[PDB]
Design a binder for this molecule. Sequence first.
Ligand code: TPP
Ligand code: TPP
Ligand code: DNA
Ligand code: DNA
Ligand code: DNA
Ligand code: MG
Ligand code: MG
Lengths: 536, 527, 532
Amino acid sequence: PSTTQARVVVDELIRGGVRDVVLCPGSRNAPLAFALQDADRSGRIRLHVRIDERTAGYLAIGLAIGAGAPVCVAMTSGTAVANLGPAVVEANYARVPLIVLSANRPYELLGTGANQTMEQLGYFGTQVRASISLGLAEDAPERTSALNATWRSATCRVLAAATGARTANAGPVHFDIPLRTPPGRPAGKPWTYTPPVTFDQPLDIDLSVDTVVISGHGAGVHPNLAALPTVAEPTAPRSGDNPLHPLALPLLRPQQVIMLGRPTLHRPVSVLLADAEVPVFALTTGPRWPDVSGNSQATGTRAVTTGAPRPAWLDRCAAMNRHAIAAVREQLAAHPLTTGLHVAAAVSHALRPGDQLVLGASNPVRDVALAGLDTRGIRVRSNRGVAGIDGTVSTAIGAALAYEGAHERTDSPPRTIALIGDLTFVHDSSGLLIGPTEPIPRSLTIVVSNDNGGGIFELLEQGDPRFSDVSSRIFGTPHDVDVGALCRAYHVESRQIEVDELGPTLDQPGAGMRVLEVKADRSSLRQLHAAIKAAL
Amino acid sequence: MNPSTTQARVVVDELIRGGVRDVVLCPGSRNAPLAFALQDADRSGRIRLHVRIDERTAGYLAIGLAIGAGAPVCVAMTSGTAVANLGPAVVEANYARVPLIVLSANRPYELLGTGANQTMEQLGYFGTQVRASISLGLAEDAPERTSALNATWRSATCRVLAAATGARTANAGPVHFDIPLREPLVPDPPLVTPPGRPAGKPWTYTPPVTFDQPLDIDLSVDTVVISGHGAGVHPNLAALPTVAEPTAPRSGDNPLHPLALPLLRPQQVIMLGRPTLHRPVSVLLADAEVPVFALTTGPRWPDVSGNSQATGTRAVTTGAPRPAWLDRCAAMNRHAIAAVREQLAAHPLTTGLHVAAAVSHALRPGDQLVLGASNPVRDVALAGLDTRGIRVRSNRGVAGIDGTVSTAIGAALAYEGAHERTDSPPRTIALIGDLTFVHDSSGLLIGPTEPIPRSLTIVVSNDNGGVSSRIFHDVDVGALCRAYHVESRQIEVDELGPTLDQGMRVLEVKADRSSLRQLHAAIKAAL
Amino acid sequence: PSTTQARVVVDELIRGGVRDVVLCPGSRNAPLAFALQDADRSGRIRLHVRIDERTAGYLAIGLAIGAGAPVCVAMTSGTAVANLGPAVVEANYARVPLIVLSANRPYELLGTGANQTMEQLGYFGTQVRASISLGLAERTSALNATWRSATCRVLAAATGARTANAGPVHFDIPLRVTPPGRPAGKPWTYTPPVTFDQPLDIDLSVDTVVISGHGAGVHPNLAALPTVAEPTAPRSGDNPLHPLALPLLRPQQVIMLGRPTLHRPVSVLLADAEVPVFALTTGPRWPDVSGNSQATGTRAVTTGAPRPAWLDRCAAMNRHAIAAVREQLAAHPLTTGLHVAAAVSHALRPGDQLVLGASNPVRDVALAGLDTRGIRVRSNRGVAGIDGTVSTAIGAALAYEGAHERTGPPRTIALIGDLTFVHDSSGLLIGPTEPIPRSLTIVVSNDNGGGIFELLEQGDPRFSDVSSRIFGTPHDVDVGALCRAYHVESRQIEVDELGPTLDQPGAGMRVLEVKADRSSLRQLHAAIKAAL
Ligand SMILES: Cc1ncc(C[n+]2csc(CCOP(=O)(O)OP(=O)(O)O)c2C)c(N)n1
Ligand SMILES: Cc1ncc(C[n+]2csc(CCOP(=O)(O)OP(=O)(O)O)c2C)c(N)n1
Ligand SMILES: O=C(O)c1cc(O)c2ccccc2c1O
Ligand SMILES: O=C(O)c1cc(O)c2ccccc2c1O
Ligand SMILES: O=C(O)c1cc(O)c2ccccc2c1O
Ligand SMILES: [Mg+2]
Ligand SMILES: [Mg+2]
């Protein structure tokens, strides 16, 4: 009955490329729970069990962005929708193939004097690419074949919407399997096959006009833009090797901007993208496109270029790039205290091709860009879809698990190194709790630049000295957490170290999961950035 | 100029730059800034304004102006139930992939919850039916912010346009564009609108996109093509026998009658678009014995009742159909349509099928045909209409009866406008059942100030009919036509063809429902 | 088993007071269709079938406000949700107990590449008081209890039985000798009279005016006060204040009853920060204009009494406003909607049901000074649409006549504009199988366009060149031929004889058309103000 339907869906889901599913024990039995257990023992799919439904959703995001696979999470309780909300919104904005699995009871009253099987909020209506319900399995062995095809093709429709197999717009899907082995295609092929879909929108750009590339989250690779000065966010794949340090951009006067993906960092980027005297061309990989103050002049997916940049423009930007990273390095050297920017510069020098970098929001993701990281050869992950400081520990854990599993399918597994701030760490500290029955990454290291509060607020307008009396409680928000004791409580190896130890410590493989705490200072963060501006 | 006027003129100016050539408008006080702006563009000849009274049928008018020429069409109305009345047209525009922009005026959102007159939860009313629901935001009284506001208003408008036309998604559909407006709502007694791009370019240019998904298919396997609503043109599929719905564009010269399909044994079928029509088409699709390849123009693809091997946008073909297979389908096609034409002539009295055959015999290349989504689209398909060189429209999105008359009027008007931008205008002939005509009879209503189609003939085949089924009317079609001042002459099926050679008129042809069961059974037995 | 379930649910709806259910032919069978057919055959319930789903929704509105009973309408097609939307919005805002019946299918695909059983829009989540689904059908005595309690739940939410906020409810009954209910016809779960009490201390010595709007309650302790009552407000006293007199007075505080929506002077005062406004409503919601309402309640505990001079000043402006309207209507040659409204107002006798369309009609009746005492006045003031007014009158006539018939046939007179009439013209077609009112007269004041815009800013003569096409919207519809096409009795008369025509009974349904002028509306109203 349901059991055959259950095994059919899981089989099709595996054929569709799902390799990881995330579960939490709930009052109701999970949708497909027994079928997933069977598949997990046989080695066809990998289960991850958590108690915290919120960190479990972010765990599923990590398992998806770690290697690009669609990931399932099976809701189990009345609080699951509420707890999965944040990760679903992130999956929508960051275009992450996340399949949320539900199980409705159609023989039960709905909307009356009882808690509902699925406590429904409003976000499913606005966040998901599809909400598909399979419909009740029926006792009909005469029609066994007809239901097999109906179940499997619908599962392919779920996967198609999840991975953007026809829309070029991956994102979350709500897959419902209500509650009261037929074979798939031969050679393991999916039931309904959707080929690679190319979505193409050419755009004429004249490269002789002084041009800068600004690539952000979700940017595509563009070989014909490789030589242009490029301000690339850390999660943006780089097409060339002519980088433009973000602090150098406000000291230049570009006449034309090619904008790749969705930029979210640096105030001078916002100022330039909003400049009515500067044409801005949005090149994206999906149907969506962003704008700053309504200044995007055209949208497309690839450039058709004529002309070539004037060598004086390239030399002027190249000299501005060298000037910018020099001021950063020089005044970090002349700065007596350790700041998060110091920490980010140390992590940047320690990484090597093949690593995976997972960056928290707030200062870490900006600090790494300011330090001049060369992301070539490195996979950079960061939840830029909504830029939350929640769920980052489990994002790194899932991203490391997925990435290490992909390396396995082909030497020791590649390094996954994470740089997050202290609030970010305390937010998702329950992500460290992993039972001995669950998969744990072999080469994950989490670097926590701990300046005992939110350092990025020392740089905004509320960090101005005229607010010094009142800004500590409501923007600084110190906590005095014993990071080492918290890691001890969760049985994860942890050490507090100084900046010079980071490179050596990271090079020496430790336990599968380790937390490297570096005590940083934000008292002097504003003065440090003011000095970096003054050196420019 | 006050904010509401400035904002409404900027919005209408950008919509014209986006290709809007026709706007349907419904009266109201809250939408006065749009109406004022729209009439000026009408008087300057940038658009054609169409005023209607009934929002619901006005939406299907807008649909017709969209499918007749292929352009985005706005419908603008006041706040409250005026917006709810666009519901039915939005559902049809959703499934039919029609670029219908619902341009609603609204009270300031700050009044929602105060009990203000005619103030409801507008934003989001249409839910998932629309491609997007976009609120422009209340216009600030800020003269120094004007240029900035111009950039954001225009950019929002092009987002509305892009979602509605599928400029980047390849999935055209309806879009809700809500505009909160505040007093003053009429232009001030100040005698320049913030400018858009030079040379009439759109604020955010987005070139039409290419969405490609190639599919390996082997034509040596005995194949039949089934092409439904929204199907595309496939030259490498032109030689194969094709069962094509009336609104599906023909790719070749090898037709297959729908009655002939269930008497043949195809080994694979290529499905084009979304087959909505034939009952035998669906019975063969719901068969795991025969593989199905779905070729669509956009991201959507139909539930095949299972057993769809693959979906794509185009075929890459190896091999060629068996000559024997071609001869067999071609024989059965002749046999099926010969059985229809012979039983028709043998039937003593004129039926709905006879009227449909007479219409098809009278069409000629260049004509536009609008069919009611019930029996007319089936009857014409049974008569074997060669839709090549003909534009065939029908609201096959949900196949409702709402707005069928207005859709025909909208399609004629938009079709004629396209011809006008290049001798005498082409003909648009509509075939509507009486119950459908009775239902949307108020869709005939065109105020004396508004455009009437130049060459539109609505053919009503009246058979006085098709626990709720107990209502199945004897409603005078002529009297209805006088009530909305439309010339109507009742005729017979033999005068139809000659008559159609002769502005907007209705030709009622009295038909019989008594003998179709006998007629249809006679066709089944002749196969 | 679903047959038993439907019979149980239909039976519980009868016991819950449902007397009328509206149906539409659609792609699949309606929910409860057979059990509803048996109830209609046996006379326990009255079915009304229409083709137009939108007019069928408003028919249910009429059948609900005509006598206060909960009314069901059963969706049967894909476009049903979309076509029912306008009525459901009105039912939410006007607090009308509308039960929308759905029959979802749990054994079928949902959300896939196919047309859906229900094409869902976004409004159900914003408008309805509840969404209850029964769940698919040896345990028959327990299932009977679950089904009947759930059905009472639906009824309670729709009638505001525990919330005091009646409104629309979505009731889903899934599908792939009948168990009795409580004895003596009692409902399964009894919810007794609920009283939501919220007293407000108001000093009546302060110069006070009362403004009452839609849904206003009756306050015997406010009878003596001057009252600017909207037509659909039940009057508690005998001291009216004409709305045009309001700007000639200086009230010091205002008691606002229900939800007012008419007259700019009412809005201007309700927003005056120097005027305390107390909102007395019958339900949990309360209105505000510009956030000026100082307090809310359900009733007033009063201290003091109005000043004798205040009563006299209000009464004098009241007479002056009545004199201004009556006199200027006499010195105006052409006939307008305001003349037609006055003639209707004088033809009404106690026991009548007056149904007023939006636009000028419901305003003109207020300006004509109609005493609503003894009259049952209906108007779709929830959203003030001009849609669905014909079927609203028809359903209200049917429910009102059915109330009287069960007592041992009062008149329903409708006054609507021409645009309003053309909007819901499809409501005139009723099959011979379907209930038809016996004493419904629809007066159509036809000035070939929307006369209300002649009275607004867009009616200023500076827009005379452009106003007619986009605000007037003339249509030249032959109203006579329209009613003829639907086999509806209709005559076209002058206003001189509309009075007498309404005095002599006619066919069960009849349309009286009075040709009107709107090119002189702005001058007429300007003269009324100049005569004030
Ligand atoms: C879920 C969530 N809550 C609150 C915020 C607001 N916020 C943005 S950055 C930030 C400071 C983060 O502190 P930390 O992790 O210590 O980073 P650093 O101090 O290194 O900047 C906060 C609270 C957010 N982005 N996401
Ligand atoms: C469904 C709907 N659409 C549009 C409007 C806007 N509107 C308000 S009054 C009016 C004119 C009504 O015309 P008519 O029925 O002739 O009344 P008159 O003012 O001429 O008496 C319009 C179009 C509305 N209230 N409801
Ligand atoms: O390019 C992307 O990946 C991307 C992702 C998004 O979530 C967006 C949301 C709004 C607007 C533009 C977006 C966008 O361009
Ligand atoms: O190809 C099309 O045009 C088309 C359009 C649609 O609205 C569909 C809706 C559901 C399922 C398939 C669909 C489809 O194939
Ligand atoms: O009293 C009523 O009948 C009533 C009805 C409504 O629909 C309201 C909506 C918003 C705010 C107040 C409201 C109100 O006071
Ligand atoms: Mg910090
Ligand atoms: Mg009028």
